[PDB]
Design a protein around this ligand. Structure first.
Ligand code: ZN
Length: 46
C-alpha cells in the first residue's frame, strides 16, 4: 500500500495472495480454494 496504488479488484480475495482469482473459486485462486478444504477429509474416519 504505497501512497495508494492503482489496480483492478480482480485479484485473490486474500490479504496474502497477489494472484488472479476466479468467481468459481469463490473469488479466491485455485491454490487458496484447494487449501481452504479441511486438511484430512479422507473417505474413512474413526
Ligand atoms: Zn489465492
Amino acid at each position: 500500500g504505497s501512497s495508494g496504488s492503482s489496480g483492478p479488484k480482480q485479484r485473490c480475495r486474500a490479504p496474502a495472495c497477489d494472484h488472479f482469482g476466479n468467481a468459481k473459486c469463490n473469488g479466491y485462486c485455485n491454490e487458496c480454494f484447494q487449501f481452504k478444504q479441511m486438511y484430512g477429509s479422507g473417505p474413512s474416519s474413526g
